[PDB]
Amino acid sequence: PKSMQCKVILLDGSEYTCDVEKRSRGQVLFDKVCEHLNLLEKDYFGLTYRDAENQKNWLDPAKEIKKQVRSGAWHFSFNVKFYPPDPAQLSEDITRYYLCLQLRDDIVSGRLPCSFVTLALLGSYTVQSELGDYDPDECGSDYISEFRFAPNHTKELEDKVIELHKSHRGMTPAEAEMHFLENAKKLSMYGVDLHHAKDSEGVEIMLGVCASGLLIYRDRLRINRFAWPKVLKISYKRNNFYIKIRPGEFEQFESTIGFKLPNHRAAKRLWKVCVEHHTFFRLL
């Protein structure tokens, strides 16, 4: 039986390497990574790969790996796919731990915008979990953490992390991680997967996919929201993406809203992530 080497970037930035039979489905590799991570609450997570256009794609666990990566390398990242709206209800601390690691990357990358004070507060809970109690011996007036907290670091931010870290004396790692998540879950872009698109006029918008529904970001003024219950059909055709909205009370007709994506692969990718979010979260 011929086997293909897989490299998976883990959320702490280390590499997991394993082999699978070359006709293996995505679930096979995912199960190996999840066993490596001692992770049981696996339904929130997935593997990503980069396609020949360098776009992030979810590895479909039901389909052959080779039919997804095609000409590309068998190189993956382990990621949160469905962000829990209420991380306190997850069964295991280790699940909360991986969710924190993902969110730390979402913050540092700028995918998850965050006020100065919330960057410092989240940073302070990370430091508490990772180093434990504040120690002045390691932290002088000139201290800069090895920990990445933000898309740009300033000394003011480093100082505020330390001031808040001092307040967390006695806090255990699982407790600090739960505080991290209770704060992160409130951020307007928490667990929002953003897609560039054009409205049926030609105006550049962003489409956001998350637990609560589909978001349309036109600009700083006027954000549209379609809760998943209010969506009966999602479809794509060529470069276009459409959603079938349920009629409101006493309306005769459903209403269909349409968007232009960069290319056909982008429209298909947005359709699939919407269907998957809809299916996963219509049990809330």
Ligand X SMILES: CN1CCN(C(=O)c2ccc(F)c(F)c2)CC1
Q: Which of 59/164 has CB closer to ligand X? A: 59
Please answer whether residues 37 and 31 qualify as being in contact, where contact means their C-beta atoms are separated by less than 8 angstroms: no
Question: Which CB atom, from 112 or from 210, has the smaller least distance to ligand X?
Answer: 210
Cα 11 from Cα 34, distance rounded (Å)? 12
Measured in degrees and rounded to the nearest 5, phi and psi for residue 103 equal: -65, -40
Based on the shown chain and the rule CB under 6 A, indicate whether residue 280 belongs to the binding site for ligand X. yes
Contacts of 110 (CB under 8 A, 6+ apart): 151
What is d(CA 208, CA 194) in angstroms, rounded to the nearest whole number?
A: 5
| Residue matched to tokens 């698109």 | 197
The least distance separating ligand X from the CB of residue 128, rounded to whole angstroms, comes to: 27
DSSP, collapsed to helix, strand or coil, labels residue 242 as: strand
x-or-dash string of contact with ligand X, 84-123, rule CB under 6 A: x---------------------------------------
Judged by beta carbon, residue 53 or residue 92, the one nearer ligand X is 92
CA–CA distances in Å: residue 2 to residues 5, 22, 48, 96, 132: 10, 6, 23, 37, 47
Q: In this chain, which of 17, 141, 186, 283 binds ligand X, going by CB under 6 A?
A: 283
Site string for ligand X, 5-44 (x = CB under 6 A): --------------------------------------x-
Residue 3: helix, strand or coil by DSSP?
strand
Distance of CA 253 to the CA centre of its chain: 35
Q: Nearest distance from residue 193's CB to ligand X, in Å? A: 15
- 259, 235 in Cβ contact below 8 A? no
Measured at CB, which residue is nearest to ligand X? 283
Residue 134 CB-half CA count within 13 A = 17
**In whole angstroms, what is the distance from residue 76 CA to residue 267 CA?**
22
Q: How far is the CB of 85 from ligand X (least distance, A)?
A: 7
* Contact range with ligand X by CB under 6 A, out of 24-32, 148-156, 213-221, 275-283: 275-283
Q: CB of residue 86 vs ligand X: minimum separation in angstroms?
A: 8
Nearer to ligand X, 46 or 123 (CB): 46
Q: How many chain residues interact with ligand X (CB under 6 A)?
A: 6
| Binding flag, residue 62, ligand X (CB under 6 A) | no
Q: Please tell me whether residue 217 binds ligand X under the rule CB under 6 A.
A: no
> Which residues of this protein are in contact with ligand X, per CB under 6 A?
43, 84, 280-281, 283-284
